[PDB]
Design a protein around this ligand. Structure first.
Ligand code: CL
Ligand code: CL
Ligand code: CL
Length: 163
């Protein structure tokens, strides 16, 4: 475990993370995809061997000894708000199980279902609150990765609010 488990936020490419493992915002089919998923495919292509997994699940594949946790959030274009919210919560619960099983002291994580799976909505708060519900009982240092300057400020605010 980390000595004093923390949350932090950085605005940069998650493929350049300084943590012991990474969470991919994956598609259910294990395809290279777009956005975070394409960056992850370029950096750790070996981790996409048999990485397909259903919505609301996470599947870990090792790239050498470096764990890539493929977490599949719902596409809100297809899910109802209600069913999408349940699947997004579930995906983060499966990430917490994998992070615990691996024994890592730190993890890099993006905000699931906030990009091309957002159904054209702002889901910063919804996605971040499900991340906290899952990861609060783990003792890994969590580093959240984002690309937008205003999102960085809001995520930082939300972390600081809990102290
Ligand atoms: Cl960058
Ligand atoms: Cl997304
Ligand atoms: Cl972002």
């Amino acid at each position: 475990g980390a000595m004093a488990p923390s949350y932090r936020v950085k605005r940069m490419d998650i493929a350049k993370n300084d943590e012991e493992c990474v969470v991919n915002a994956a598609n259910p089919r294990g395809l290279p995809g777009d956005g975070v998923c394409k960056a992850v495919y370029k950096k750790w292509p070996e981790s996409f061997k048999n990485s397909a997994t259903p919505v609301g699940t996470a599947k870990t594949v090792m790239c050498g000894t470096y764990p890539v946790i493929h977490a599949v959030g719902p596409n809100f274009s297809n899910y109802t708000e209600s069913e999408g919210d349940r699947e997004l919560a579930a995906a983060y619960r499966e990430v917490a199980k994998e992070v615990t099983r691996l024994g890592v002291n730190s993890v890099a994580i993006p905000l699931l279902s906030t990009g091309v799976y957002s159904g054209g909505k702002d889901r910063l708060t919804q996605s971040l609150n499900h991340l906290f519900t899952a990861m609060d009982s783990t003792d890994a240092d969590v580093v959240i990765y984002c690309r937008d300057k205003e999102w960085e400020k809001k995520i930082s605010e939300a972390i600081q609010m809990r102290t």
